């Protein structure tokens, strides 16, 4: 009977935990935890939530191979 607007994010559980860490560092990110592979996230952050993801997967991967 209620309807709220958000951003449905579908990803693997590891990326879900990473997004929960983004919400744990910056706040005002994740609105709800739907299941193991979906999340309700503030739309105005999605691009950021994406870009930061790249950053946190750029700090994790390393691999300069030089």
């Amino acid at each position: 009977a209620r309807a709220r607007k958000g951003a449905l994010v579908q990803c693997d559980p590891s990326i879900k935990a990473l997004i929960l860490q983004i919400d744990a560092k910056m706040s005002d990110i994740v609105l709800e935890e739907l299941d193991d592979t979906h999340l309700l996230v503030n739309p105005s952050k999605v691009e950021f939530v994406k870009h930061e993801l790249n950053r946190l997967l750029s700090k994790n991967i390393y691999n300069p191979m030089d």
């Binding site: 559980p13 590891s14 935990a17 860490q21 994790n60 991967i61 691999n63 191979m65």
Partner: protein
């Protein structure tokens, strides 16, 4: 072997005043090249070794040539001594015995007689990749001959000191390509393969909350690594091939060893039990999966088991694992029409250890070996004997890993 005469042609070119490094596989006959050079020079030859088994092998090569008992071929060790004679000599010494500092067991004078009387003329250093260290610089600083030779199999290290050997002993003269040698002699085809296993959520968040070497205790103890490990073990046992499991960590080797119910060899282990496990691996067909640590790999390499599994690993020591892997690969030679050697690297996604194992695979690319990635071989879903496949066993294993973190 043709490449051995290709190396001896350089000695046949100039003759006098020469020094360099010759790269030959462990399965090749570099000791035969040392014997031939000793026959060409005919002088007091000293062979620097780090283990007594290599001394016994060099003595066996001396027996393959001629003479060892008469007062000419000497033996230097911490147990006994043997006299020598000029104009011709063959002796093997230990790095730790010649180095030392002030500890003495009334034997450093016996070495300072071989170094004081000036009975030399040919230098042979086994495994030159270990030379980058102060003790070896002291050994070179306490010796001086007319011709020097460096027998080694590898030289990949990240200490940025391998280039110094170009002036400490001499620049590398001949580097044999292991692929062309594989065409000359089937030294087991190298199939490099990384197994990408999924990572659970709890071990992922706990893995991120951990750091340093403690997070390795959360990277190895992943349930999917146990499931894929059992799948590879049962698969190789179904193919009728023996399995060798490597682990840089002793605790993980004991965990997988006790959970798989197979013999294990690690540090502080009695030598009689090690020899018993070796004989059971050589003769008993019921033991086709052994768990070997660095002690079981550096001391002895067996020509059996075409299945090599890698689970535990340490940061930076990827080149050493590539050298040991190369030793197990070169140790398997018998000229077979098939002869497919399989190296598996059990790695989990989003972990800090796979990104160094990729550097190890880069070392495996520099050698010309073939590398391919493997996400998952279909067949593990049909194995009901897999452990830690149920959420109950995954939670219990999680509690055991948490207790292990509380102990460390």
């Amino acid at each position: 072997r043709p490449y051995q005469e290709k190396s001896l042609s350089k000695m046949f070119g100039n003759g006098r005043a020469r020094s360099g490094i010759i790269v030959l596989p462990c399965g090749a006959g570099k000791t035969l090249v040392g014997i031939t050079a000793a026959c060409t020079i005919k002088k007091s030859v000293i062979v620097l070794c780090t283990s007594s088994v290599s001394v016994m092998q060099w003595r066996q090569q001396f027996l393959x040539x001629x003479x060892x008992x008469x007062x000419x071929x000497x033996x230097x060790x911490x147990x006994x001594x043997x006299x020598x004679x000029x104009x011709x000599x063959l002796v093997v010494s230990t790095y730790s015995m010649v180095a030392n500092x002030x500890x003495x067991x009334x034997x450093x004078x016996x070495x300072x007689x071989x170094x004081x009387x000036x009975x030399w003329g040919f230098i042979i250093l086994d495994e030159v990749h270990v030379v980058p260290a102060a003790m070896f610089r002291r050994v070179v600083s306490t010796i001086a001959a007319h011709a020097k030779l460096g027998l080694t199999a590898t030289l990949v290290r990240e200490d940025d000191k391998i280039g110094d050997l170009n002036f400490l002993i001499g620049p590398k003269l001949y580097e044999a390509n292991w692929m062309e040698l594989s065409q000359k002699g089937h030294i087991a085809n190298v199939q490099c393969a990384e197994v990408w296993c999924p990572m659970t959520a709890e071990f992922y968040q706990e893995y991120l909350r951990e750091t340093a070497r403690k997070r390795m205790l959360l990277y190895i103890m992943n349930p999917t690594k146990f499931q894929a490990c059992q799948f590879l073990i049962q698969y190789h046992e179904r193919r009728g091939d023996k399995i060798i499991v490597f682990s840089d960590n002793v605790y993980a080797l004991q965990e997988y060893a006790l959970k798989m119910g197979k013999p294990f060899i690690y540090g502080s282990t009695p030598q009689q039990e090690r020899m018993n496990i070796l004989q059971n691996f050589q003769y008993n067909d019921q033991i086709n999966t052994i768990f070997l640590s660095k002690v079981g790999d550096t001391s002895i390499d067996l020509p059996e088991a075409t299945c090599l599994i890698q689970i535990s690993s340490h940061y930076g020591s990827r080149r050493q694992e590539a050298q040991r892997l190369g030793r197990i690969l070169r140790a398997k030679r018998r000229n077979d029409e098939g002869f497919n050697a399989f190296f598996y690297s059990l790695v989990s996604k989003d972990t800090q250890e796979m990104y160094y194992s990729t550097k190890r695979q880069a070392f495996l690319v520099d050698q010309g070996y073939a590398f391919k990635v493997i996400t998952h071989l279909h067949g593990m879903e049909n194995i009901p004997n897999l452990a830690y496949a149920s959420p109950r066993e995954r939670r219990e294993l999680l509690q055991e890993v948490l207790l292990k973190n509380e102990e460390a």
